[model samples]
Target: MAAAMFEKSEKFPEGWFFIKNNSNGYVLMVDNESQESGSPIVLATLRTKDYASQLWRHDPSGYLVNKKSGQVMDIAKGTPKAGVDIVQQTQAGSNVKDDLNFQKFGLSPYGHIYLANKPSLILGIKESFFARREGLHVHLQLVDKRHLDRKEQRWDFVLPVV
Candidate 1:
């Protein structure tokens, strides 16, 4: 497949965006009921209107912070495993250089967003196919570099038309 032609704009803007998974068309969302520090991130179909849990921002430090909970996406326990769960955690101090605290996302040539941390692990979903209820809570992982070509590694950043 050809690379996506992403516009050369500010990649991390201070606003809300839907982080949509390219393969399944599900948006990355914070589990509303699970608002604690260890809350799980899930995928859900977009609504006609946006909700606070579905909106996210890329802080200047490159951390993806949820609007409602004010927590950032983090790898559980900073494990480097392939199928570890991704969760939201209270921000570590600014001096902390942990992989779970910071993230970086870039647009692929195919117009998909690829997210990674300082350790170079790409964000990916655990499941290969989409299941209605099962897929919603599937763990987000930091997979090996070889899986980067998979569609699960690619996501779309959809901004609201304001």
Candidate 2:
């Protein structure tokens, strides 16, 4: 018997997971399930069955790749500032530390999904817009750690049910 199996790892999991928001229970996904690069990243209410749009893989390189499109989660234009939008783009960095290619993001110990180079900032939904009425798409943006206690700043890695 292969008795070497042990407790689950910290971040890496067996397969794709639904990057769910701790605040509203919505899951991260490319708006409309578009496979095209540069599509805006957004959140939608979780459905009974999972879709490829809601599934993502945290690669060994620390880049979160969308299962539906194979594109990495990217900071819009690689700019790290509050209100900047998050998008899915092809991994195009010279090195992991490159500033202009901020596709590398990691799950922090506290459950905040943060930019790889700019640890001070983490992912958040714009303006707590879950007010039970709104017609616009809910965008994910780079919000600082100061809002860490807020629901938008925290996330959960949910495995797709087999």
Candidate 3:
């Protein structure tokens, strides 16, 4: 008698991705690589040798989960404003509060990652023009369909390992 066992190769949803900004060319990361809840989401140059904190998975549940901390992206104060900040926090139970899309996210063809309920708004850096500096906070900003030229509204998900 003989037996065979094989494991399927990891693919797609199982892989972590680098969230690269289309304009600034920086990678989004957890501030200070903090694993605690409430850490600000910021931008930093891709450290090929050390980028676990920059890796993310676009979860089926519509939450952006950090590969390092396992926390989901959340709108600060559960409020959405043009200048409001986004942070990583522990996932909340729907039973605690129904009808909340605050943790849900939607991706676009043009690399726009926005709230699933609000496609007009996008994840953008603060003072987008001066974002050459690393560690700038990312905030929610509205980009009308006419503003396709606004590069900050764009982002691309890239596999960390080819």
Candidate 4:
């Protein structure tokens, strides 16, 4: 009965994980079951099998790259607006130097992961009761930091066994 060991590293491990929403139990997924670039990243129910779209890796520079599309999760149009959709974009040649392409994962006081982008917008679910509906594509937004206190703003990073 060995306990699982999670390493404390500067970068998030490159592995499979179910990014679960603490409030609604939905897992982040690529919309329409497509791996193409520019796909909308939304929240959906956790699947029995780990799909490549659901798997993510955090690069050293803090970019969250999807294992399937190899695209980095980005704010649509690079807008700093609240409630804007989160999309997967192919990294530009100069992406590393682009602050808008970076995301920082911080531990919330409630013990969940708090994801914020370089623009200082925290990752959160849009205000909608139907957000938990299956097959419904909901908008993942970059909201004010104060919203991080809400359960919907908290996320659990569950690493799957390889």
Instruction: State how far residue 151 of model 1 sits from its true place (Å).
Output: 3.2
lDDT of 1 by residue, 56-90 (tens): 88877667788878888776766545566778888
For residues 1-162, write the lDDT of model 4, one tens digit per residue: 112122222345565666777776777788867778777788777777656777788766666777878887775666545566778777656535544444344434444443433223456666448644454343445443555587775767778763
lDDT of 4: 0.61
Q: Comparing 2 and 3 by TM-score, which wins?
A: 3
- Candidate whose TM-score is highest: 3
Which should have the higher lDDT, number 1 or number 3?
3
Residue 28, model 4: lDDT of 76
lDDT, each prediction:
0.63, 0.65, 0.72, 0.61
Q: What ranges in model 2 sit over 4 Å off?
A: 1-14, 93-101, 128-147
Superposed model 3: Cα runs more than 4 Å off: 1-14, 94-99, 128-132
lDDT of 3 at 131: 41
In order of lDDT, best first, we have 3, 2, 1, 4
Q: Per-residue error at 136 for model 1, in Å? A: 2.9
How close is every model to the real structure, measured as TM-score? 0.71, 0.75, 0.81, 0.71
Best candidate, lDDT? 3
- Candidate 1 TM-score over all chains jointly: 0.71
